[PDB]
């Protein structure tokens, strides 16, 4: 039992880190969709216009209604994935939001 | 791969501007709290001076 009871007590710690990192998520997902068109317009061989991103931090991502499809079903991939992969994943977030303060630990240590 | 690479580096200047957005907004905010604050502080002290100005009239009468 005692396994699946730690097995809580992690998806709470991942709870918490995915809120410590709330902000920096959406701003990522922002400039996400924003490089998925980009890219296809590169990869054809043409311009990357104001239009491109016409097409489509909190606020744009309401503003934009133009669903992807790729991006969403990674997103699934995601959810469903083991919580272990989940764990590894909020702390890679972590680092990547608050980087100043991670330099700076080292330093001192 | 090197496309994505490449595709950051165009849009770095957005970056920037939803960063500093983001800013601004939280200064915003901030700032505002701390106006109320000093507003309440202004209301109270004018009820002081009210009751001791009664109370200054009342030993006056």
Known sequence: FLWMLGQALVDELTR???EFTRHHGTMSDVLRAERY???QELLQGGEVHRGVLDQLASELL???RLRIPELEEAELFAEGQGRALRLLRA???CVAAHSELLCYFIIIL | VRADLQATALLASRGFALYNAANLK???FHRRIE???LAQLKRQ???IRAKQEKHRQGRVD
């Open chain 1, 16 to 18: 918490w880190l995915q």
């Open chain 1, 37 to 39: 068109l980009l890219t």
């Open chain 1, 62 to 64: 309401l503003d934009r």
């Open chain 1, 91 to 93: 702390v890679y977030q």
């Open chain 2, 26 to 28: 939280s200064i915003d």
């Open chain 2, 35 to 37: 106006e109320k604050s």
């Open chain 2, 45 to 47: 002290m004018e009820r």
